[PDB]
């Protein structure tokens, strides 16, 4: 057996996974989205396939700054896609902040979404174009394209160049979104490098 395993692809049961963080620690289980629309909020429903409720997640190493920020998440953010493009809507009373390398390519730019705004955060056509442009740049170049399939968002507090908090590990409440569809296409290119 000098050949490798035949690679097969099955459609993901979830179009994205979301991991919640407080400062630099994972908090709670990873949320998986089986529906085209979902909301990440600060409430306490643990059994809604369309709601990732952060208010019920406990953290015994949590300080008062994180505790106060959690109370301001409120209605949180609505995440849903149309076609090959993903977007985020701020339902909360406080703003939300987004770091999307796929959006920066069009590299740490953090964008505010004021309460009530509807903003786009991903375009799969521009990712495929970049993925096509990256195959010429080597294996390690394409391998680091995972950053384009992941989107980080912070509630209430911002971070980056325009803020005292330099990194996302300094924000009290943030999430990391993984786009499973594009990750599969990236997987097929990586296996062919």
């Amino acid at each position: 057996g000098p050949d490798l395993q035949p690679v097969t692809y099955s459609e993901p049961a979830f179009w994205c996974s979301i991991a919640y963080y407080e400062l630099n620690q994972r908090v709670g289980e990873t949320f998986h989205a089986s529906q085209p629309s979902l909301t990440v909020d600060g409430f306490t429903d643990p059994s809604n396939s369309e709601r990732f409720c952060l208010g019920l997640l406990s953290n015994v190493n949590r300080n008062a700054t994180v505790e106060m920020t959690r109370r301001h998440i409120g209605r949180g953010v609505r995440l849903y896609y149309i076609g090959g493009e993903v977007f985020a809507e701020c339902l909360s009373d406080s703003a939300i902040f987004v770091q999307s390398p796929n959006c920066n390519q069009r590299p740490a730019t953090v964008c505010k979404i004021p309460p009530g705004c509807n903003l786009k955060i991903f375009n799969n056509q521009e990712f495929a174009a970049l993925l096509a442009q990256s195959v010429n740049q080597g294996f390690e170049a394409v391998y680091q394209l995972t950053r384009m399939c992941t989107i980080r968002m912070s509630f209430v507090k911002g971070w980056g160049a325009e803020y005292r908090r330099q990194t996302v590990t300094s924000t009290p409440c943030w999430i990391e979104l993984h786009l499973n569809g594009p990750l599969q296409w990236l997987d097929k290119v990586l296996t062919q490098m």
Partner: peptide, 22 residues
Amino acid sequence: PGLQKTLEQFHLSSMSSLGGPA
């Protein structure tokens, strides 16, 4: 080769879907 095929499939599917290569 087969890499250019995958790039062309993705270029096509990227226009209207987040679906994978299945």
